[PDB]
Amino acid sequence: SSKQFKILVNEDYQVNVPSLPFRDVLQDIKYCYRNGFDGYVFVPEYRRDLVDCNRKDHYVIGVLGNGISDLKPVLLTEPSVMLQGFIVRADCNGVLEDFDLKIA
Amino acid sequence: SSKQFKILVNEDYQVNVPSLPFRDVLQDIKYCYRNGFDGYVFVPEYRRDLVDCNRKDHYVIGVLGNGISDLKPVLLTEPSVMLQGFIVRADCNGVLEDFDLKIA
Amino acid sequence: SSKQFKILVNEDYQVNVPSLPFRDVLQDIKYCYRNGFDGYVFVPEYRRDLVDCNRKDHYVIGVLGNGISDLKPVLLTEPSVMLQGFIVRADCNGVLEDFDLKIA
Amino acid sequence: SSKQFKILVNEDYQVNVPSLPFRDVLQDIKYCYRNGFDGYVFVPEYRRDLVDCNRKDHYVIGVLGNGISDLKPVLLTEPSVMLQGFIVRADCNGVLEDFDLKIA
């Protein structure tokens, strides 16, 4: 029903990340659910000002919900109180942490 | 390293809940990690207004962190940006949801 | 399915209103859906400051949702972005307005 | 006095939408009030970040007021506390919901 992943958590580094059309992010979420999140970092919602992006009308991976989190494409302006953070393509340093995630 | 639990999520009902000395909540967390959370509900932090308690100076079970969550005694006024919600003893209804938790 | 109602809208007057247990507000919602809202006023969420009650752990009628609104018991601290306002027992002045409502 | 409509509600998808001179939106509101809102979506005000347009000095259909809502041309910058959302021409999916609307 869900899967555990190790993901690098970025709470310190300003990053400029790629965004993609909705259907592309759906596909990349499915890829990462199968293969893991190497090449991505998790930015907690409370550090969202670390994330810059050139096409903010396009999407990044969102992590949403209570408990085991759902993954779905979101804008960086996503205002839901259930937003945990974003999983974005970046090569900065951080702290590897354990997540438990499912596809929305 | 962690354990999955099904916990009733309460986002609708006001609950008056017991708080306890810090050391007692530590023991209650261990018991619940072993035996499950029947009779408790998870109240997300954005609905902290739902939760009231007798002893402002005593603690409830806090759910903290990014990813798989840590369990630790917290005050109901805990301001940490890492606070996900509370697990409190209450008899109200809710929605059963999956959690992945570890002892802090 | 839903019903249209004329309801006095209060955007100006401070009101002290009764709050009730959840089950009681459910019954009051059903009564008002059958018989109308005379004796109540609608306070829009943007003037929620106008409403006070002596039991802040008890409920009033909430008006929520997009389009035809749902009616359900809420606390005066209800933070949902879907909250339109409250329907509360009060005898103040206001502007009579047309609503379209259904029971949640 | 008013009419009920089924309208696709969009809370998920970024939409680049046409904006028009004020007088043209007046006429489009009249047409849609007669013929329905097929091809349009309702974006709630709390997801106004989803909507972009080319001419930010030109207008879209605004949904305003307490209760049965008024339809009136607005800018996407519309600051009124009575703004419920926008009805905009867009291709995306959504959730069909019932509305009760009148022309301002």
Author numbering:
A (entry chain B), B (entry chain A), C (entry chain D), D (entry chain C): 2 to 105
Give sentences copied directly from the paper behind this entry:
FIPV is responsible for the deadly systemic immune-mediated granulomatous disease, which has a mortality rate of nearly 100% in cats. Within the genus α-CoV, feline infectious peritonitis virus (FIPV) is in the α-CoV 1A species, which also contains a few other closely related viruses, such as transmissible gastroenteritis virus (TGEV), porcine respiratory coronavirus (PRCV), and canine coronavirus (CCV). The SADS-CoV nsp1 and FIPV nsp1 structures were refined to 2.1- and 1.8-Å resolutions, respectively. Their space groups are P212121 and C121, respectively. Each asymmetric unit of SADS-CoV nsp1 and the FIPV nap1 structures contained two and four subunits, respectively. With the exception of the regions encompassing amino acids 105 to 110 of SADS-CoV nsp1 and 106 to 110 of FIPV nsp1, all the residues of both nsp1 proteins can be built using the final models. Therefore, we could judge the characteristics of the same subtype and different subtypes of α-CoV by structural comparison. This comparison showed that the overall structure of FIPV nsp1 is conserved relative to that of TGEV nsp1 (with an RMSD of 0.53 Å), but it has several differences compared with PEDV nsp1 (with an RMSD of 1.87 Å). The overall structure of FIPV nsp1 and TGEV nsp1 is highly conserved, which shows that the differential amino acids (Asn2, Cys35, Asp71, Ser91, and Phe102) in TGEV nsp1 and FIPV nsp1 will not affect the stability of their overall structure. From the surface electrostatics, the structure of FIPV nsp1 was more similar to that of TGEV nsp1 and the structure of SADS-CoV nsp1 was more similar to that of PEDV nsp1. Compared with other α-CoV nsp1s, the ability of FIPV nsp1 to inhibit IFN-β and ISRE reporter genes was greatly decreased.
